[model samples]
Target: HTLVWGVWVNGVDQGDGRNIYIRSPPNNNPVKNLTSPDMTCNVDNRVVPKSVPVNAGDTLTFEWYHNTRDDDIIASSHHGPIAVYIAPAASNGQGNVWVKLFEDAYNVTNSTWAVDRLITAHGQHSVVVPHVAPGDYLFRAEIIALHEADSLYSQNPIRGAQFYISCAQITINSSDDSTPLPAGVPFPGAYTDSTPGIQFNIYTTPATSYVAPPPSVWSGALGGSIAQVGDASLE
Candidate 1:
């Protein structure tokens, strides 16, 4: 089997299909594509997923590039190997999505020292949290993806970073009381504090309909793997 570098979730690779290669900013070898309005973004920026859609009640699992066969890299800080926030799409326009969901902080990383106290796949870089609401959202942050071009690198990528979603609009009816409780606070309700807490992980539920992106925006190895999984409805 061939090895590749990049991000993945629920058994899917996050890169848009191409081999996960290094393209630090300033040099622009692979091309920089940072997302718009980057705030609280890492030193290297954020990563957008190739596919992000999930069903309500679904368990969204996150996994980093586990296999050493890929050309991935560790971003050299508390930021690298870290899993940041999960935001829903801004609008219903396939790529339309918001910026944040959780307020606690998405510091997922392989290093035990960084903020993402959780060390991703040193053995298994993956986390499955319960899906609260639904709608278009984005789970983002910096991860290990690349090959150093003579060692000189950028603080961020064009898209800043890259990521992926599990299923389309996870739906939990108003009558369906299975929504997860807030982080650290076990008892459910919309984000109590103005800060939003774990509620950031949950977005709009009971959406009218769910739709995935068209083929126009997909390509590469990761893309081929998740393209079909985009519009999945949650149980």
Candidate 2:
């Protein structure tokens, strides 16, 4: 089903606000619900008519709903990782180029992945704005539901696996900070079917180990080892 992932800034819910990103809803055919990496940048050329200002280290909360409201929880049927990415706005002023900022794959403490927790947690997710050079950026939030990912190449793409994706316009600023942005990979080129995160069978026994899309979080600081360094390395 097309999910409603809400955007919140500074503790206030955008609440079906104008200038929000668009996501694919259940369009009768489950296969068509999957939004591809190529479509991640403003799906269907979705024009982000407005942008919200954000500061480095600020938390942007994203809440996904089963449909358009928060009353119902997304069915736990599809289980997988949820991630957030950011890219410098293209020269044309649209959100196109992108890179990973935060990704939550497995909960080592609870022995579960994002899908399992999101089902019960009411679809709420959050990520921190990286402390990078002041500029405009496109923020992307995605959930890859792998209930049927065992068949990587099903004739009906969405039926085999699901990619719920959306992009929000944001401006990052920090005159007082001089950190460089992390290296980023092109959106359509970032993911591939062969990647372990995209093809593994969630039903397999002993699902103890899982690989998230990597290198790791963009640490915002130069020469910082707590986070990974380059997006092209994973590409």
Candidate 3:
């Protein structure tokens, strides 16, 4: 399975997967249970230490892979959308302060999902950092694989919608807070088993288009499928 290997802000590579809730490669896997606490950033998702410095409009690239950066990205059969989100770092990602920045689902002309482009780019997914007030925040990067999403996620069995996620601690330095951001939605609450995008049947013929599990991107949120910066965190 693909997982967040490390995060690069602007051009700086934050080493050891710092701040990202990534365990050793052997223990790395996706969270398929939507309501599970792990859905926030996987199990035991605690902050490592310092937050990387990023300007308001910097581009953060998330690195993903199997065992290592040199290894295969993931099984070719696994396909779905990529979503980027931002929220206050103090909330630890559980609060309902997270806002969607970008969601790249599909491109009709090329007939490829955002994941396809991500793999083609050797697992480098980039997002434009939107304007924000200077503060520490958790940059949440997620990839939803709908290969088995045709079914539901039973509490006991825990099936459907494999969500591979990781959060990087970043301190944004911005001069302006004029850009608007959405109110945001809860993590496990943002999507459900029956959600059109989560329970989607990729094996069947859709004819056209794809929908990413929502809380739609903030209006004018630019970046993922290349998007937001930040908004008020209401506790």
Candidate 4:
């Protein structure tokens, strides 16, 4: 498991404490006690005010860390794809709608998947903000740990699979108002257990060939894997 507690704008840290959009549960519980926290946000009804101001072409970074005090840097037992999505805030002030902005399902270069590489390289990733109309948006970051996804019912079902999800609220301002935001998929429906990427086992697959997660990144534009390192920038 990992904790996503910070967000960066361009190359600067947003602040010291946890960014406002992160869900705050009573009794200080971070993990949602639901079956599909991976798909359902299970978050408190809150969002930070324009915590970070960004232009259409700038970069937005998601920063995370291992949840345990053990020597392991990232979750070694869990492995799956990582993704990011952006949704326009609804007029009613609910930001549940979302569209894919960036995703690192599998690394073609390393012949490894995103979760495996994240555990190996530490949890750090960046994505180029896509070109879209000016508006307030919700940036959702998700990491699905599929270590036990193969079993629908286990000895202890609560520990079967894990999901680490965080949402960041940002305002997008664009000088060019020509492009429209891509179509979006609603949360709680964006993912399903039957999805091949979420249910397949990684241990038996060919090291070089595998099917990436469904809903291939939107148009493959403004969506690519940035290095998982400090000072990582997107072009």
Candidate 5:
């Protein structure tokens, strides 16, 4: 039940129950069914009056927690990859509108999973906003918990990839569209029951590499890094 309470842009806090859906009413329940519409965002998502204004080529940091920012990001057991996608806010938020922004599943060189980085950084993971066209968009950020992902939804409904997702309203202003969005996959269509990252055994089998769901990351994204500029201020 990890939640994103803060969205920091260039070391400035852009959230205090603002913009992102349900920032105030904390709900830690994960979205389990990839086929469900909840995969697009989360349960009971609502529209906000204002979209977070962001400049292209800026760094964005999402702060995670269980019920609060100070709580453990998520149980160490809930470990796996982290991903981000962006799409035009006007779309139905389905099908292929999404553009893959970033992904970090496993780093074998250091033998550390993506979630480990979140834990080490005090629940903060940063990604660079690519130079896409200026527009209102939905910044869909997610963390996939693969601990119990070994089984398919039909095989065992309760045991599957647990998706902690947040959809934030964003307005990105860019000088040009040098990095237009490439083709991407649907949330439900991307993570099928048989997807490599979706159906995996982390408990019984040890992996040297992890293949997270894809249309692959965009060329302009700088992800999987910890944010430290205003680090101590949050503490």
Candidate 6:
């Protein structure tokens, strides 16, 4: 079977209020349910949409969709299987791997932070977790594959490969206090049922006036008002 993999746009799928959502292990065919086929982790090089802001102390539930839109069930090690990881100001930027905290929704028996592990092979697969802290982050959803038994995870070893996580920047707000917010509620920090809320409120910051219109307030004034600093590096 053919597997499709790519970064899904946040708020479209695998999303929470303002928290950006991306699948780590993409969807696969043979494994169907994310069990037989494994997924790896990586920083999806993408901008965290400024609208998505995450506050400290919020929890992110990592997970992957086991079924498809048509309501097809995939194979899984357990019921409603998924992977979970958390970020605490750490794991930010490029080339860094997320420390896994949970798998299949069960906290590791005695593990503190699940070390980042790589699955060997190429196939369709994805990892998604629910209730991610709304915040700014780089993310992506990718796919992987496994050839056969006796390969990695099989009694034998197999060559492992990888794909890029679909990248996006997500921000989380305190507006929606729960995962899978109820219908009619905006995704995280959003305050609307219209187009403007989901998108950023972009505009130039207008200059503040000094009442009497000081020289610093002059629109064409040079080296004034907006903290103009001489660059020593250029010399």
The best candidate by TM-score is 5
What is candidate 2's TM-score against the reference? Answer: 0.77
Each candidate's clash count: 58, 6, 4, 0, 0, 43
- Full-model lDDT for every candidate: 0.26, 0.58, 0.71, 0.58, 0.75, 0.25
Task: Give candidate 5's error at residue 160 in angstroms.
Answer: 0.9
Q: Give per-residue CA lDDT, model 5, range 1-235, as digits (tens).
A: 6877767788787755434432222477888887888888777556766677778778887777775565677888987988888877776477788877888887787777888778877788777778778888778888999878887766788888899988777788863777776656776668777667888888776756567876778776655475444563554
Q: Model 2, 144-219: lDDT tens per residue?
A: 7777877764354544556666667677765345566655665555566655676667788345576765546666
Ranking by lDDT: 5, 3, 4, 2, 1, 6
- Per residue, candidate 3 scores C-alpha lDDT tens digits across 59-167 of 7877777776735676777788888888877677776878888788887888888777777766777777778667887878888887877777764355577887877
The number of residue pairs in model 1 that clash at the backbone is 58
Tens digit of lDDT per residue, candidate 1, span 1-235? 1111333345554443221121112211222232322222222322333434434433333322222432122232322122233333343212323222222222224213222332323212322333445433433333322222112123423322222112122222222324432222101111122221111111232112211111122111011111122211121
Off by over 4 Å in 5: 18-26, 220-224, 232-235
Residue-level lDDT of model 6, residues 102-162, one tens digit each, is 2221124422111111111111222333343454444322222212211232222232211
Off by over 4 Å in 2: 18-38, 91-96, 154-159, 173-177, 221-235
> What TM-score, computed on C-alpha atoms, does each candidate reach?
0.33, 0.77, 0.87, 0.78, 0.90, 0.30
lDDT of 4 by residue, 1-235 (tens): 5665566677676653253655422222233233443344435536554446788767777766664211243556666678887777552123335677776666677776677776554456777777777787767777767676554322345543455766677777763644577666655555555555655555676524545455667663476464444432331
> C-alpha displacement of 46 in model 2, angstroms?
3.0
Ranking by TM-score: 5, 3, 4, 2, 1, 6
Give the better candidate number (2 or 6) by TM-score: 2
lDDT of model 1 at position 6 = 34
- The segments of candidate 4 whose C-alpha lies over 4 angstroms from its true place after superposition are 17-21, 24-38, 68-73, 91-96, 153-156, 207-209, 228-235
The Cα RMSD of model 6 versus the native structure comes to 23.7
Candidate 5 minimal-lDDT segment of 10 residues: 17-26
